[PDB]
Amino acid sequence: NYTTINYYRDSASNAADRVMQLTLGNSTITTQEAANSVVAYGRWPEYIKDSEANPVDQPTEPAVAACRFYTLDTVTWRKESRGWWWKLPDALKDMGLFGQNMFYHYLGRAGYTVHVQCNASKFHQGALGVFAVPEMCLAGDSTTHMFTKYENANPGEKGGEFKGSFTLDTNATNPARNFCPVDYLFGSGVLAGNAFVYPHQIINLRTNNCATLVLPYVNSLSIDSMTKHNNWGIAILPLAPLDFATESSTEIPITLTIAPMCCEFNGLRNITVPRTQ
Amino acid sequence: NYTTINYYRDSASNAADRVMQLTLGNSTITTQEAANSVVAYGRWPEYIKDSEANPVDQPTEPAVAACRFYTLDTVTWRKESRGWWWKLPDALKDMGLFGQNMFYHYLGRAGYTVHVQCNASKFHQGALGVFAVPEMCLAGDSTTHMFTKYENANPGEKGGEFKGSFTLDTNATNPARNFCPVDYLFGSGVLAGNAFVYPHQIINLRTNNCATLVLPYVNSLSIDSMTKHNNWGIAILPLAPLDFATESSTEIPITLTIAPMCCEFNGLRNITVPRTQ
Amino acid sequence: FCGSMMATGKLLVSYAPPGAEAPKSRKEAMLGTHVIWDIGLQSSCTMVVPWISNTTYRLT
């Protein structure tokens, strides 16, 4: 036994599976070759509780008007693809009434259902790692730290691509001020092979055609500014390169469908019009 | 006594006050010089009941996102003003997420809270009749019947003005195809003095500064196309002309604030982009 | 679907209630009622067009 007694007031001073259907609003997704679906950290998206509400004004919950699947621009997977990234809610800023509520309010909160679709025949090869990264900070391309500008950090539904090797932006007069995400460094100075600590799913073309990730709202705050802060980052990397019948030049589309969930907005004002690239 | 017996199957064959606050969504209206508020036909707006639902697909109810006050362009009341008209939901087609839901869906339904505001001093004169007319059909300006085109019939938030006298559009090559609403005929071949059969309020500048009309959804159908059909028409007429201290040239603003209520939309598709004037 | 067993695909069958422009591309069509049909062991798909009408009856 030992005896412990606190001699101070403040406690700081104390000693230390395959067939699935997803319906949101007026949108429905059917899948037959699914590898199940992952709920990030086992937490389903939810609305702010009265015990955690910071803003006092009544929130607006568009529900089905905004809690529905929006499909982003399709990308092409080739043998030379290094990977793609999107930022949420940034990727949905021009998507129906969700983007309208996003830009008309000072504070916004939403979870997501991300559905990545990549169908290929039984004679194709390749694997895609689909990772949901909270606070997916990406490295810049200049000797100046944290120098990436807002326009490039928020590409929108197109997102960005990973790079095979790091290139330094030496243009002093007109710096690019863009990201330089290196695929094997995961764009953030960490080995990509460890990226599986994040919620993820692998689309192995021999097994499944799609991946589904249910992202809860993750943040150090109950609600934040959606225009300032991207809660999530979706990163897709080719773990196994695409291959097909030795024909070469094969390319298959990857489509991304994101549904915001449990959307809450506070602080209605005039609409925000961010500066464009 | 008399005896009646039906000899057929189908039954058709058988013989024959001042201080008020209105909060909708994130919008609030305070009034101190109100002449109460009228509920048209004594019916409060409501959602479609399961016993009357024609469409089968799940509706979307944006609630606070669209059920909120939008303020239209202010008009000017002069001594020479003959009156103004707006069409609902046409006047709100470019108003936030309400217009977005209106154009993204094939079917829409909504009641309204119309708040007309016209403040003047205690040394002003004039009365405004504010009338809510179901199916406010207006007369055209050509010898061709029913020849008014869609672009003019749906002016938007600006609405239209009544005319002192009827003018015929004789331009055969480029007909105006616009309305010609005559103020004393109420724009529809009926004496304006009888327009009080419609739900209405009078803004008498010596008594009240505002009028409030709660319009239920009125139609021969439970739900209709908002782009094709204007459920309501708001007509404002000077019953007593504006006058002030004999100074002349006096003009006071009239502002219109409409909040849709109990919005229901069905038939989600790609957005409708109507042809512009 | 009356192709071979070795054929695979996904179709989108869409119903748009009236009022807007008739959908000229899949991007417009997916905004209305629709079903995504996967052609596999089951070669038939049913899309129900729901009764969405202003009037209680339609003309023929």
Swiss-Prot record, chains A, B:
Q: Where is the signal peptide?
A: none
Biological function: Forms an icosahedral capsid of pseudo T=3 symmetry with capsid proteins VP2 and VP3. The capsid is 300 Angstroms in diameter, composed of 60 copies of each capsid protein and enclosing the viral positive strand RNA genome.
Q: What is this protein called?
A: Capsid protein VP2
Subunit text = Interacts with capsid protein VP1 and capsid protein VP3 in the mature capsid.
Q: Which organism is it from?
A: Poliovirus type 2 (strain Lansing)
As for subcellular location, the record says: Virion; Host cytoplasm
Q: Which cysteines are joined by disulfide bonds?
A: none
Specify the domain of life of the species encoding this protein. Answer: Viruses
